[PDB]
């Protein structure tokens, strides 16, 4: 099998170093070239540059032109990507990809499955939890606003997974503090507000575990 | 610096249906393009080279066509697994160039959100900051104008936004929006409104409540 593998996601603070990889397996590594590619968050796909593994002969886009240096090792099949001065604007998702030459065009036939680098000047923070409860019907909705952390993710579930059925945890967006936030809700029938309701957020980064009850007021 | 323009952005499409998506090069490339798949958290999938050769493995539902300026990716009848998002890449010279990619989400019916507006909570309010939140949910389609006001009048620049993927179940968004002030600011007013905007409502819903006295 033809296979592109990378390393794990990267959250770094501006100004620090990076090299992230890629490995190929199932094919002649010095005989196909490697490039790399970048998708920021909610963004379309950028061509950063390219390398043939065999001289190490490298092909950038103007845009990235400068800014980092892709590199390879074929000692062990692996290709780098790497920067010697992150900036926060470097954040987002690094594709390699095999080049396969067909139909007289180079096509990116196999990818690797990515590698996440967040790049911050926030520090490990875990979550603040507020209640989100209607003012004093049909459905009825209620939630837990999960406020100030870093970096992503939190996992949210609600009554310790036992309630699943219509709930929804939001996307989070980035704060201008630098912090994330994110909302999680659900819908129940009014004539239930009897049961309890009690949002469990879990933040691994900073080792951190939130339980907030709900209440109906 | 051959720029890369699909057609269009987004499409809603039916199980079943022809799919067609466009691609036009800033200049000629002759049959160096390229079609892409993507779905939500993993990597790209090759699927047309060369304008019309069909990938090894890719189904044949999946076609191009087209040269020079104009490329057409079409998918015969479309199947579940087919919602994602294509991106074209045009080979002819460096630097490789990717077009802004096309997602194709589900038509269903319209549906109008129910609307929800949350208070600030008092263990919030303590830290010295206001949030409060308005829910849209399960709406369709994605197109919604949500706008705070504070004592009737309009806000800007103090809000944020996000909204769900497609639901699994009933192929509807939902969406949240959150208005961040200090608690100094939020106890000065009183009416906090959510007013929503949307195809499926006759006229804009306002949800509100006033501060205090809740
Ligand atoms: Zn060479
Ligand atoms: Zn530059
Ligand atoms: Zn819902
Ligand atoms: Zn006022």
């Known amino acids: 099998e033809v296979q592109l593998v990378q390393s794990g996601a990267e959250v770094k603070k501006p100004g620090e170093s990076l090299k992230i990889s890629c490995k190929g397996s199932?094919?002649?590594?010095?005989?196909?070239?490697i490039s790399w590619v970048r998708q920021m968050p909610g963004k379309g796909l950028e061509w950063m540059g390219r390398?043939?593994?065999?001289?190490?002969?490298?092909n950038y886009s103007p845009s990235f032109q400068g800014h980092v240096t892709i590199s390879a090792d074929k000692s062990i099949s692996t290709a780098y990507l790497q920067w010697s001065s992150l900036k926060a604007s470097d954040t987002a998702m690094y594709y390699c990809?095999?080049?396969?030459?067909?139909?007289?065009?180079?096509?990116?036939?196999?990818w690797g499955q990515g590698t996440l680098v967040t790049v911050s000047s926030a520090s490990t923070k875990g979550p603040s939890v507020f209640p989100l409860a209607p003012c004093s019907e049909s459905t009825a909705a209620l939630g837990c606003l999960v406020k100030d952390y870093f970096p992503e993710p939190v996992t949210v579930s609600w009554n310790s997974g036992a309630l699943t059925s219509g709930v929804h945890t939001f996307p989070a967006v980035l704060q201008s503090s630098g912090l994330y936030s994110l909302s999680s809700v659900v819908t129940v029938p009014s004539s239930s507000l009897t049961k309890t309701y009690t949002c469990n957020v879990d933040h691994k980064p900073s080792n951190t575990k939130v339980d907030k009850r709900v209440e109906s007021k | 610096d051959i720029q890369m323009t699909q057609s269009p952005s987004s499409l809603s499409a039916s199980v079943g249906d022809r799919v067609t998506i466009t691609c036009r090069a800033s200049?000629?490339?002759?049959?160096?393009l390229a079609w892409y798949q993507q779905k939500p958290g993993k990597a790209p999938k090759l699927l047309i080279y060369?304008?019309?050769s069909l990938q090894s493995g890719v189904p044949s539902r999946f076609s191009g066509s087209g040269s020079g300026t104009d490329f057409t990716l079409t998918i015969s009848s479309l199947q579940p697994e087919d919602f994602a998002t294509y991106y074209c890449?045009?080979?002819?010279?460096?630097?490789?160039?990717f077009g802004q990619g096309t997602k194709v989400e589900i038509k269903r019916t319209v549906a109008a959100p129910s609307v929800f507006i949350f208070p600030p909570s008092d263990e919030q309010l303590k830290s010295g900051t206001a949030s409060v939140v308005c829910l849209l949910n399960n709406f369709y389609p994605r197109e919604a104008k949500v706008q705070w006001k504070v004592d009737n009048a309009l806000q800007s620049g103090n809000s944020q936004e996000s909204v769900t993927e497609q639901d699994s179940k009933d192929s509807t968004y939902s969406l949240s929006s959150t208005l961040t002030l200090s608690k100094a600011d939020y106890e000065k007013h009183k009416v906090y409104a959510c007013e929503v905007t949307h195809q499926g409502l006759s006229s804009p819903v306002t949800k509100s409540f006033n501060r205090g006295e809740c």
């Open positions: 890449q045009q080979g002819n010279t460096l630097s490789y160039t």
């Open positions: 060369a304008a019309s």
């Open positions: 990809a095999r080049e396969l030459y067909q139909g007289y065009m180079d096509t990116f036939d196999s």
């Open positions: 390398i043939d593994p065999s001289d190490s002969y490298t």
């Open positions: 199932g094919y002649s590594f010095t005989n196909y070239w």
């Open positions: 200049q000629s490339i002759g049959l160096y």
